């Protein structure tokens, strides 16, 4: 409690040795190494038992250390001359804190992500003499753990050495079961993309070795079961984050063999009754996540062949499945969903209470723990269980714009909904009335809705298309090769003449008297929305003769020479959209207007997008 | 006295690993097919080889083939231990695939399922398979592909008088597409199980014959004048990755490099360049368009394959509909070719972009590897990794800024990872390999190198982000998809994302913000600003003169 | 069996049953035109992972018994699968006589 101000002054002391200006990395060894005395002062203030258990003064400590290593990438490769660089000294010391914090998932994920910053985003500077002096260090310290794991067969091992041997193996395998974004090509066995690495077969070998150890040992310690659940936690984390992770569907897998391995491993884990511990959600999490990846997709047979569940059934007891009430509850839910999707449609009926489909129950109960409702507040379990129960409903499928209107005006589709005029009038009454000045975020959400709703207006006379089956635009979201402005239509309908959403847009955003200060973000949002409108509709005449820049080309003047580069290169993307029309540009006068506009920027920081704006 | 030690189990059931391998063969089923692979091979006969026999693997004329496979599997379970059971199966199924293949009249329907079954045999226990079996199987799959000479050699454009009056059959084309795809996938599988062996034994695999055969089949896969099959391009560059990865991580690195001629590399790297300069556009992935510029993943070969699930598996329903399933036949069940294709979702195009972006990450990843193999200068680390990689960097920044920002596709991030990766393929090329970066080849890209570095150094101004309040209003514009991703990850699939302790989501409103910076093409990571700075500013070569440099600095401020 | 050319499972792969339109007792699904021995070997592979030996035995005993039963009590259907299923059941019984629990023997 007294050493929060010490770290709060120490982060300022680290940032004080930045530079004279805002640019500071300093990759080389400067001729001045006093902060290494602070570096030793960081990690030696980390392994302790009294108030290291406080969350904030540990997190600020490791964030201070990552801010030291981020702005000083020379510290890792400073050649602490035993035989190596001191990043090898950093790995095992950093491993000791993580192996002292094995049970708290926050304290090890938050450590390993910044270890990923320290190896990926910092040993890109050095390469060949330094990539192979840490990718071998992991192989040596993992060879050491798998080597010391096998002497527990021959009985001459200890009992506490067994514990931290398994926990250190757990942390080394946990660092590498992340996504590809954490450890990039920094470590040489994680090099290959495409979900298929050198670590995959080595990892499956190590999990088979640790299952062989669990078969070879015989011990009923309670915390041994606690650390024995961590390996199935690790093996379900191994396969759930190699998924492609699409928009809102269940994240599809990349390799069927990894799914087969994880299902076979945790099924062998359950057969030998390993890791039965009271009120522990870990196995239930693994079972529900792996079933959520295999709901009705191409791997469902792969779920039912390699994770059989029908031979633990035991209908005649309130103790329904044998293991533990969380694990038995999750497996009962899985069995309920498999039995539901097995039976025909005429055999199922709707509940009207839990909004789930259900079969003719039993002569017994057998339906309690599946929808009881759910357990102690293990916050992910009940939403997993809701997804497993509610993916069968075959309702209105989730859509991106339907999400962003339900994220914005919640509870909207208790009505007709897919009628297109009522959502326009609801957007109208929200865009005219319900703001005084405060929606500096909600209006940006409104203008991304007004951008995406313009396409859905454009898909009539494109009579069949609908609000639900519009995932993305066919013109503004997907793109093809060649000249990209050939796809937009010269004789598309005019934005002022027919598109009601540009009437809304000019009624609020372009006729407001304070366009010169909304914010940078709302200007970017109005430029994206006006980009989508003028890519689906003809823009109005930029000049009639009475001066009269038409309140949107004025925004192109306001943003094209603006201070930030983002509004500049965003506003340059609609300059070609003014250049394409007919009965406004058939005798090439908007072209001449844009030409004599682009000849009028002798300002240096506009010299970038101008070259884009010409081309 | 020492009541501490962990006690053993007196009834350790070491599982019979050959029985588990038997069961993994017997219920091997490719994704999308209705029947198991052995259960498909029970429905296949071969009526032109009157009697097949190699080493007591007798197949009669009208007999089911899978009967003979399961007879071999049961007969060799009692006899052999696992490493002998593997290569017994490998050579027997290889001889069967061979004499089904080299025959003038006989249909080859058993061949895809036997290759996929062979792949199931290989990758079961990679520690168990002795690598001479891997050498024999690799040589057999390479000359098996040179038997199937004509799948990867269809011409670019046909005759104008190519009348499409024809039975329009797809079943034979589906067979040999499955043969080629499963064959290249088996090449990838052989090399990763050879990659998983202890690192002193790679010389038992490689000789001259391995590399000449893969040189031929690699020229065959990454085509120039024929229609590319993208399914084999993935595996044919992943094999080159496995090669360049084990050259790094072995001890006797010279006897691989002495075994490799430089002509192998300068035939490989030009095809990798020509792959790298192709385009990825979701609106015409699955369209058939102009050759060798868009990686297109044709409609008529769209299925998963063995290692990775690469498409939407539209041709997986036709694998089960290739046999009659109540009959013992040799010719295929007829699949009409023009029935497929029915239009509901362009999301399939987005995930195929995701795979093709990982393919380009793979190509410049093996560039990054074989920089580190040939750290000294050679024929092949030779300055065109400035030209092609700087062309790639400059265009994937330029049409990022012109076209992709605000397009709410999931593939923005990886597409702005590639540029973020390939700068490093610039950087250590610039810093550690300047001695071959010749004076003419740097001036071949003086436009594009300096412009690409300048689009990183423009981000040191940073009047855009500067806070928290409006940056989340930017990620409601460009990065709503990753918000959906992290909410579905937080509520379902991550152990640490519940009861968030007010330091794990301050990390989230750090890293989502730096992510949406890296997407918005303003404020990249500071390390890449330094790496782009110390190529432009540093005096290894006069890219700019000092009166030309400050003409670039005035277009940021400075 | 002694004198037959094919194995018993290999005979049951060559048998269909075209009057029971769909056989199912306890996840032992047999389609109409499907080979019967396909379903036997699917049960054998599926119940190998799950059951230990004394449960694998009486699972096979009651499943093959129900199959022999509804092939038998039927007016039109041929009973060609019945001898081979009875002989297969005998192979199931006398493999490890110490393993087979005697309520299965009673049934
Ligand atoms: Zn649109």
Curated annotation (Swiss-Prot), chain A:
Effect the entry attributes to changing residue 213 to G: In MEC1-101; impairs both the G1/S and intra-S damage checkpoints but not the G2/M damage checkpoint
Residue span relative to the full protein: 2 to 632 of 2368
Q: Where in the cell is it found?
A: Nucleus
Q: Name one GO molecular function term.
A: protein kinase activity
Gene Ontology annotations of biological process type: chromatin organization; DNA damage checkpoint signaling; DNA recombination; DNA repair; DNA replication; nucleobase-containing compound metabolic process; positive regulation of DNA-templated DNA replication; reciprocal meiotic recombination
Q: Coding gene?
A: MEC1
| Organism expressing this protein natively | Saccharomyces cerevisiae (strain ATCC 204508 / S288c) (Baker's yeast)
Q: Which named protein is this?
A: Serine/threonine-protein kinase MEC1
Role played: Serine/threonine protein kinase which activates checkpoint signaling upon genotoxic stresses such as ionizing radiation (IR), ultraviolet light (UV), or DNA replication stalling, thereby acting as a DNA damage sensor. Recognizes the substrate consensus sequence [ST]-Q. Recruited in complex with protein LCD1 by the single-strand-binding protein complex RPA to DNA lesions in order to initiate the DNA repair by homologous recombination, after the MRX-complex and TEL1 are displaced. Phosphorylates LCD1 and RPA2, a subunit of RPA, involved in DNA replication, repair and recombination.
Q: What is the lineage of its organism?
A: Eukaryota, Fungi, Dikarya, Ascomycota, Saccharomycotina
Q: Which family does it belong to?
A: Belongs to the PI3/PI4-kinase family. ATM subfamily.
Assembly description: Interacts with LCD1, which is required for localization MEC1 to the RPA complex. Interacts directly with the RPA subunits RFA1 and RFA2.
Curated annotation (Swiss-Prot), chain C:
- The gene that this protein is the product of is LCD1
Full-protein residues shown here are 215 to 321 of 747
The name on file for this protein is: DNA damage checkpoint protein LCD1
Description of post-translational modifications = Phosphorylated by MEC1 in a cell cycle dependent manner and in response to DNA damage.
Instruction: Kindly list the places in or outside the cell where this protein is found, as annotated in its UniProt entry.
Output: Cytoplasm; Nucleus
According to its UniProt entry, this protein's organism is Saccharomyces cerevisiae (strain ATCC 204508 / S288c) (Baker's yeast)
Miscellaneous note, as given in the UniProt record, is: Present with 606 molecules/cell in log phase SD medium.
Function as written in the Swiss-Prot or TrEMBL entry: Forms a complex with the serine/threonine kinase MEC1 which activates checkpoint signaling upon genotoxic stresses. The MEC1-LCD1 complex is recruited by the single-strand-binding protein complex RPA to DNA lesions in order to initiate the DNA repair by homologous recombination, after the MRX-complex and TEL1 are displaced. Required for the recruitment of MEC1 to DNA lesions, the activation of CHK1 and RAD53 kinases and phosphorylation of RAD9 in response to DNA damage. Required for cell growth and meiotic recombination.
Q: How does it assemble?
A: Forms a complex with MEC1.
Classify the source by domain of life. Eukaryota
């Amino acid at each position: 409690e007294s050493h929060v101000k010490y770290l709060d002054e120490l982060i300022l002391a680290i940032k004080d040795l930045n530079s004279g200006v805002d640019s500071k990395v300093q990759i080389k060894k400067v001729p001045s190494l006093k902060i290494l005395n602070t570096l030793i002062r960081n990690l030696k203030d980390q392994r302790r038992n009294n108030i290291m258990k406080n969350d904030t003064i540990f997190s600020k400590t490791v964030s201070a250390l990552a801010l030291l290593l981020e702005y000083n990438p020379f510290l890792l490769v400073m050649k602490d001359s035993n035989g190596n660089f001191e990043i090898q000294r950093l790995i095992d010391d950093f491993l000791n804190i993580s192996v002292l914090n094995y049970d708290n998932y926050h304290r090890i994920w938050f450590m390993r992500r910044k270890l990923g910053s320290w190896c990926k985003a910092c040993v890109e500077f050095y390469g060949k003499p330094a990539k192979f002096q840490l990718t071998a260090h992991f192989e040596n310290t993992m060879n050491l753990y798998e080597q010391a794991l096998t002497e527990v067969l021959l009985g001459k091992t200890e009992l506490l050495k067994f514990y931290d041997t398994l926990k250190g193996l757990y942390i080394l395998l946990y660092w590498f079961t992340s996504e590809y974004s954490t450890f990039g090509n920094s470590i040489a066995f994680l090099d290959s993309s495409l979900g298929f690495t050198k670590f995959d077969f080595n990892f499956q070998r190590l999990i088979r070795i640790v299952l062989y150890v669990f078969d070879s040992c015989e011990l009923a310690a309670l915390e041994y079961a606690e650390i024995q659940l961590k390996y199935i936690s690790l093996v379900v984390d191994y396969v759930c984050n190699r998924t492609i992770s699409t928009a809102l569907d269940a994240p599809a897998l990349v390799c069927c063999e990894q799914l087969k391995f994880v299902l076979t491993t945790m099924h062998h884990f359950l057969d030998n009754k390993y890791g039965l511990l009271d009120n522990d959600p870990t196995m239930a999490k693994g079972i529900l996540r792996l079933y959520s990846l295999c709901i009705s997709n191409d791997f469902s047979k792969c779920f039912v062949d390699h994770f059989p569940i029908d031979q633990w059934a035991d209908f005649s007891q309130s103790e329904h499945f044998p293991f533990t009430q969380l694990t038995n509850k999750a497996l009962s839910i899985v069995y309920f969903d498999l039995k539901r999707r097995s039976l025909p449609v005429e055999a199922l009926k709707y509940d009207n209470k839990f909004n789930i489909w259900v079969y003719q129950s039993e002569p017994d109960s057998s339906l309690k723990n599946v929808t009881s409702p759910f357990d102690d507040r293990y916050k992910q379990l009940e939403k997993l269980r809701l997804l497993v129960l509610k993916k069968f409903n075959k309702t209105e499928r989730g859509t991106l714009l339907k999400y962003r209107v339900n994220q914005l005006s919640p509870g909207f589709f208790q009505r007709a909904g897919n009628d297109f005029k009522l959502i326009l009038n609801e957007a109208s009454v929200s865009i005219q009335t319900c703001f005084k000045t405060n929606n500096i975020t909600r209006l940006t959400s409104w203008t991304v809705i007004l951008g995406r709703l313009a396409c859905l207006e454009s898909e009539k006379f494109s009579s069949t298309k609908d609000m639900d089956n519009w995932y993305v635009c066919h013109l503004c979201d997907i793109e093809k090769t060649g000249n990209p402005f050939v796809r937009i239509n010269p004789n598309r309908p005019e934005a002022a003449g027919k598109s009601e959403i540009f009437r809304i847009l000019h009624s609020n955003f372009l006729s407001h008297p304070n366009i010169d200060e909304f914010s940078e973000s709302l200007l970017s949002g109005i430029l994206f929305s006006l980009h989508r409108i003028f890519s689906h509709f003809q823009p109005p005449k930029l000049t009639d003769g009475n001066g009269q820049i038409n309140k949107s080309f004025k925004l192109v003047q306001k943003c094209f020479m603006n201070s930030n580069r983002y509004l500049r290169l965003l506003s340059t993307r609609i300059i070609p959209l003014f250049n394409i029309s007919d009965s406004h540009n058939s005798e090439d006068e908007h072209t001449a207007t844009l030409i004599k506009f682009l000849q009028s920027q002798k300002l240096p920081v506009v010299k970038e997008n101008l070259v884009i704006a010409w081309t | 006295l020492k009541k501490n030690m962990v006690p053993l189990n007196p009834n350790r059931i070491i599982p019979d690993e050959t029985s588990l391998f038997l069961e993994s063969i017997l219920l091997h089923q490719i994704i999308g097919a209705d029947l198991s692979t052995i259960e498909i091979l029970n429905r296949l006969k071969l009526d032109y080889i009157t009697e097949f026999k190699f080493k007591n693997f007798v197949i009669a004329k009208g007999a089911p083939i899978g009967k003979s496979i399961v007879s071999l599997l049961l007969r060799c379970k009692k006899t052999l231990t696992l490493d002998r059971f593997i290569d017994t199966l490998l050579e027997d199924i290889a001889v069967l695939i061979k004499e089904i293949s080299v025959h003038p009249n006989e249909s080859k329907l058993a061949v895809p399922f036997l290759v996929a079954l062979m792949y199931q045999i290989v990758q079961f226990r990679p520690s168990a398979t002795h690598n001479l079996a891997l050498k024999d199987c690799f040589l057999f799959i390479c000359d098996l592909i040179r038997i199937y000479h004509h799948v990867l050699k269809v011409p670019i454009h046909e005759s104008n008088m190519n009348l499409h009056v024809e039975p329009q059959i797809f079943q034979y084309e589906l067979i040999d597409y499955l043969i080629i795809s499963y064959s290249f996938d088996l090449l990838e599988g052989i090399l990763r199980v050879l990659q998983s062996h202890p690192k002193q034994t790679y010389m038992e695999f490689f000789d001259e014959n391995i590399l000449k055969s893969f040189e031929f089949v690699y020229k065959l896969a990454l085509t120039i004048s024929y229609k590319p099959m993208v399914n084999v391009i993935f595996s044919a560059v992943e094999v080159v990755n496995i090669i360049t990865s084990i050259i790094l991580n072995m001890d006797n690195s010279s006897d691989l490099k002495s075994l490799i001629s430089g002509s192998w590399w300068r035939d490989c790297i030009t095809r990798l360049y020509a792959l790298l300069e192709k385009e990825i556009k979701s609106g015409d992935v699955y369209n058939e368009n102009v050759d060798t510029t868009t990686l297109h993943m044709s409609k008529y070969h769209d299925f998963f394959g063995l290692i990775r699930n690469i498409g939407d598996n539209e041709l997986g329903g036709l694998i089960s509909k290739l046999i009659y399933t109540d009959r013992l036949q040799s010719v295929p069940r007829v699949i009409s070719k023009e029935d497929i294709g029915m239009f509901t979702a362009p999301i399939i195009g987005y995930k195929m972009e995701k795979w093709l972006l990982k393919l380009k990450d793979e190509v410049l990843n093996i560039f990054e590897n074989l920089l580190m193999i040939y750290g000294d200068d050679a024929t092949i680390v030779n300055g065109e990794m400035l030209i092609h990689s700087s062309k790639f960097l400059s265009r994937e920044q330029a049409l990022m800024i012109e076209r992709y920002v605000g397009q709410d596709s999931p593939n923005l991030d990886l597409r702005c990872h590639l540029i973020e990766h390939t700068l490093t393929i610039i950087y250590r090329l610039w810093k550690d390999h300047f001695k071959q970066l010749r004076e003419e080849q740097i001036k071949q890209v003086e436009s594009q190198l300096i412009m690409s570095l300048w689009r990183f150094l423009v981000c040191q101004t940073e009047t855009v982000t500067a806070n928290e309040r409006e940056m989340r209003d930017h990620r409601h514009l460009v990065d709503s998809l990753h918000d959906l991703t992290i909410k579905d990850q937080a509520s379902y699939y991550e152990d640490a994302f519940e009861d968030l302790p007010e330091y794990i989501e301050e990390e989230l409103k750090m890293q989502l913000n730096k992510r949406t910076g890296r997407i918005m093409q303003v404020k990249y990571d500071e390390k890449f600003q330094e790496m782009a700075r110390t190529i432009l500013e540093s005096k290894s070569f006069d890219l700019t003169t000092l009166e030309e440099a400050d003409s670039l600095y005035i277009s940021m401020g400075l």
